């Protein structure tokens, strides 16, 4: 019966808040508003959030709290045929850990290089620069902040592709180690410790965002950036691509299918209200990105005014925004050293809490499956983080970014789309919504409304299929800058993307072979829950 529980109610929430809110909040959402017509983009965003994202977010949190056990066992007890979902969901998170942590390493690497009052990325006269360098972003040229991030920090110019990784940056390897050391000691003991640590990692960004919002809006031309941000264009509502970006962002911003929400909620009390938790968490996540947009664009508008740079050049997504564009502006304004330290520390704290969840989803799921793992929990995560750090050295190479960009697209790619798709179908059809509503009623006291039941069985599979289809329509071979990945690199990634998905039919097929009977009895044997 007994399993440990959170040491507080707030600890669970901030743990989920932290996991959900990451660099993608800062570096993708604000760009989507600018690109898709501003404040008008909130309309498809809100709708897709309402019908697509939150019901799926609600589902995992509900499933986790009810079955009270990790990802693999949860789907094992729910639909024994589909237990492979529990395997796919875990090793997806296992793949992400090989790359995602290198972003935090960059943040610390910048944070460490941020002790000085003359910032190294301001000037074009340094040793790592080239004639194409310009003080700020320009068409056809390279910014000083750019050449610092590539030719110095990453040393990416040493590499011709993914076939050549080059030497190993040991300043990066040190930064990566520190990250895992922080992760190890936080995640070491159960939620009695890691649950407390998130009080920093989750809250501290809001502290920095506050003082960066004040600093941002006070800059000359800050109001100009806000217009580039929220100025409504409703012509984009008719555009199908906008509905795809809104649907994709909503789905990825709150992650289902890493088993994290499933694991995190599994430590909640049975009669805890997980419906209010899902609503509170989802809102804060969306609210964070909205606020973060003001921070970015007030500074982006400051650049387009006083620094005389095109808004098209400085408006960007991905790591390029926070590691190049944004620090370039910081250096220009007074007390630059202060804004630099809190920003790169914020980036680090934005990465850590997320990494906590992803790893915890692996630990908890393997702890409930294999009893021997719960004993000597650290012996497991030491060997786990060792394997991560050893392979993580490849991310610390000169061709490290080429490796990072590969796993970013594939590991976390369509793998998780078809995984969550089978999650909704298994629950709402195979397991049934009647059972799911009955379970939720027994927990929070009341059953889900008619709205939530329709979304789960009908809207959500369409919602995910709508994204998956237009993702494949819009498929191109993986490329970065002018470098096109070799066809064996794309193939390797699809295996990484497929090694998860393949768990669904495999574990299903392997289970049928171990059951007695003709096809008709054994499949009702495998669709029978653990509560019978």
């Amino acid at each position: 019966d007994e399993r440990e529980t959170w040491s507080g109610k707030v600890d669970f929430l901030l743990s989920v808040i932290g996991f959900a809110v990451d660099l993608a909040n800062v570096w993708r959402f604000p760009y989507l508003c600018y690109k898709n017509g501003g404040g008008a983009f909130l309309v498809p965003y809100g709708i897709m959030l309402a019908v697509g994202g939150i019901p799926l977010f609600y589902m995992e949190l509900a499933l986790g709290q009810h079955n009270r056990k990790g990802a693999i066992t949860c789907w094992g007890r729910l639909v024994p045929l589909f237990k492979g979902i529990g395997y796919a969901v875990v090793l997806i998170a296992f793949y992400v850990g090989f790359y995602y942590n290198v972003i935090i390493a960059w943040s610390l690497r910048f944070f460490f290089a941020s002790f000085t009052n003359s910032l190294p990325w301001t000037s074009c006269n340094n040793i790592w620069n080239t004639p194409n360098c310009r003080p700020f972003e320009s068409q056809g040229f390279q910014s000083a902040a750019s050449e610092y991030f590539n030719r110095y920090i990453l040393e990416l110019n040493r590499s011709e592709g993914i076939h050549d990784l080059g030497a190993i940056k040991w300043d990066m390897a040190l930064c990566l180690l520190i990250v895992y050391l922080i992760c190890y000691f936080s995640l070491w003991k159960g939620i009695s410790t890691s649950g407390k640590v998130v009080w920093f990692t989750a809250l501290f960004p809001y502290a920095v965002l506050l003082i960066l919002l004040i600093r941002g809006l006070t800059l000359p031309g800050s109001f100009l950036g806000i217009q580039y941000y929220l100025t409504p264009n409703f012509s984009a509502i008719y555009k199908a691509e906008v509905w795809v970006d809104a649907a994709t962002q909503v789905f990825f911003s709150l992650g289902p299918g890493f088993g994290v929400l499933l694991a995190y909620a599994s430590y909640n009390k049975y009669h805890n209200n997980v419906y209010k938790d899902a609503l509170l968490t989802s809102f804060i996540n969306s609210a964070t990105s909205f606020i973060a947009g003001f921070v970015i664009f007030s500074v982006l508008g400051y650049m387009a005014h006083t620094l005389g740079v095109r808004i098209e050049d400085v408006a960007t997504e991905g790591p390029g925004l926070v590691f190049v564009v944004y620090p370039a502006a910081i250096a220009t304004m007074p007390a630059s050293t202060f804004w630099a330290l809190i920003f790169f520390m914020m980036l680090a704290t934005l990465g850590l809490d997320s990494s906590f969840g992803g790893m915890e989803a692996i630990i908890t799921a393997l702890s409930d499956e294999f009893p021997k793992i719960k004993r000597n929990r650290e012996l497991f995560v030491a060997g786990l983080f060792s394997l991560y750090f050893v392979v993580g050295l490849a991310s610390c190479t000169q061709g490290g970014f080429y490796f990072f960009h590969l796993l970013d697209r594939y590991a976390a790619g369509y793998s998780i789309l078809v995984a969550v798709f089978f999650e909704a179908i298994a629950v709402s059809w195979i397991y049934g919504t009647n059972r799911f509503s009955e379970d939720i009623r027994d927990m929070i006291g009341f059953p889900p409304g008619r709205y939530w039941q329709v979304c789960w069985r009908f809207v959500a599979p369409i919602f995910l299929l709508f994204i998956t289809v237009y993702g494949l329509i819009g498929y191109e071979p993986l490329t970065y800058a002018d470098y096109v990945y070799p066809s064996w690199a794309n193939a390797l990634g699809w295996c990484i993307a497929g090694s998860s998905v393949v768990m669904i039919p495999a574990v299903a097929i392997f289970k049928l072979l171990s059951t007695p009977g003709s096809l008709r009895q054994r499949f009702t044997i495998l669709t029978t829950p653990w509560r019978d």
């Binding site: 074009c124 006269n125 004639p131 320009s138 068409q139 056809g140 040229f141």
Partner: protein, 215 residues
């Protein structure tokens, strides 16, 4: 047969005005539409203005409206481009290009004239020799530092020896250009003989010749 040359152009302060002219020969000039195309230092072509054969049809691609006025004189066969309110982003090499037929594009281009728009002021280059240190062959070079604006001309021994000479392009730093050139030659010549670096920056009227001393 067909020849297009571009006159005018040079250093102009922001807000200033300048007029470019294009001399045409080898064809009937009144029968073809002319167009100004400028090339930015980033090596990226941008169309500016088109004028018809009779000059009754004018098209402006605009970062440029109302600042530029394209003109045509079919009597003397000259193409004019009048500029005003110039700023830094107007800095480029302006080409005089022709074509009448939109379906065939621009079939003939001129040599081009260079326009530099900056608040920076003209300075004279200080050129320096580079002495090697106390082999089958020896490398020697000439450093040209702190000048504006481009361009300068660098030759070795009054522009006699070609081979083994690498002239590096100028790089702008703090409104000042720095340039260098390397020449490799056998140690049988040097110091068998006298090597001389020849630098010319017409804008600043500074023409300098440097002798190389191993000391």
């Amino acid at each position: 047969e067909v020849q297009l040359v571009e006159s005018g152009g040079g250093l102009v302060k922001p807000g200033g005005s300048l007029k470019l002219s294009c001399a045409a020969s080898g064809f009937t000039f009144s029968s073809y539409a002319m167009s100004w195309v400028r090339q930015s230092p980033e090596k990226r072509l941008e169309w500016v203005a088109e004028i018809s054969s009779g000059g009754r049809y004018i098209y402006y691609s605009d970062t440029v409206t109302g600042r530029f006025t394209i003109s045509r004189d079919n009597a003397r066969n000259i193409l004019h481009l009048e500029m005003s309110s110039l700023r830094s982003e107007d800095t480029a090499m302006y080409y005089c290009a022709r074509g009448e037929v939109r379906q065939r594009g621009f079939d003939y281009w001129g040599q081009g004239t260079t326009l530099t728009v900056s608040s920076a002021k003209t300075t004279a280059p200080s050129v320096y020799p580079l002495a090697p240190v106390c082999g089958s062959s020896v490398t020697l070079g000439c450093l040209v530092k702190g000048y504006f604006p481009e361009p300068v001309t660098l030759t070795w021994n009054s522009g006699s020896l070609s081979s083994g000479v690498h002239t590096f392009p100028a790089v702008l730093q703090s409104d000042l250009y720095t340039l260098s050139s390397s020449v490799t030659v056998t140690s049988s010549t040097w110091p068998s003989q006298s090597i001389t670096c020849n630098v010319a920056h017409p804008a600043s009227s500074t023409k300098v010749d440097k002798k190389i001393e191993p000391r």
